[PDB]
Amino acid sequence: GVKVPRNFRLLEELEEGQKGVGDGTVSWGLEDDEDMTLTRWTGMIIGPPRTNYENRIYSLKVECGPKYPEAPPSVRFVTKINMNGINNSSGMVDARSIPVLAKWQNSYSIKVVLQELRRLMMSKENMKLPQPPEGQTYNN
């Protein structure tokens, strides 16, 4: 097998972020365009239709550490959301509650993480949760 190192993987994802995938319901890019470490990413999810998330845009912070992608990234919502596995006061994503994060493979990516969260917005336990008003964000 041929392993691509973190930094060269992250450049690949940077490029895929610009080109974009699928229907554009999730998107990602570098938070700081001078961050040579490619560590801090801005994530976006469009709430899936026929859920209480629909027509809402969620911004997220995704942090790819020194062991990425052998280890999963850190994820937190900036935009407020009621959703299982997302801490109510900080917006941090609890890895144990997101299967892609709890059962992380190095074949995964920022894209997969965002698509997973958006899929989970369609689950029975999340799709009917009463949501906060739009325009709210967590601290920090």
């Binding site: 097998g1 190192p5 040579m36």
Partner: protein
């Protein structure tokens, strides 16, 4: 899954290192090289040490190695994320060239900037004296430790 050529190049680099360039394979990945290029004399990068990393894709040596600076540097052909504009890294890449050839070229590239878009490149054109002194300042600031 490791081409003989790569084993040969690696061993030649370690035994016959290029002057001013340190380049070693990663402990966990034989296609991954850690590089340190000394700033060439008579260039604004003199005195500085610049970290690069190199990677050999599966299709090497049909495809080019991928190279990127990890040290912040003010140069016409290097962007904010360390990506290098150099012809042999894309259109002008030929299998007759080695890893050794790439590093020499990058080293040469520091001695002879290629302004000919890009904000830095524009500064090197419209005001070269100022651009050089900024490259020197950035060398003092980000390339000495």
């Amino acid at each position: 899954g490791l081409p003989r050529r790569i084993i040969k190049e690696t061993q030649r680099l370690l035994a016959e290192p290029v002057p001013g360039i340190k380049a070693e394979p990663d402990e966990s990945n034989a296609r991954y090289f850690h590089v340190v290029i000394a700033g060439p004399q008579d260039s604004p990068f003199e005195g500085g040490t610049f970290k690069l990393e190199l990677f050999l894709p599966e299709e090497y040596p049909m495809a080019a190695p991928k190279v990127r600076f990890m040290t912040k540097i003010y140069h016409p052909n290097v962007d904010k994320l360390g990506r290098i504009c150099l012809d042999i890294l894309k259109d002008k890449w030929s299998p007759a060239l080695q890893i050794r050839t790439v590093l020499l070229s990058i080293q040469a590239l520091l001695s002879a900037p290629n302004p000919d878009g890009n904000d830095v490149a524009e500064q090197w054109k419209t005001n070269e004296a100022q651009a050089i002194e900024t490259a020197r300042a950035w060398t003092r600031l980000y390339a000495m430790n």
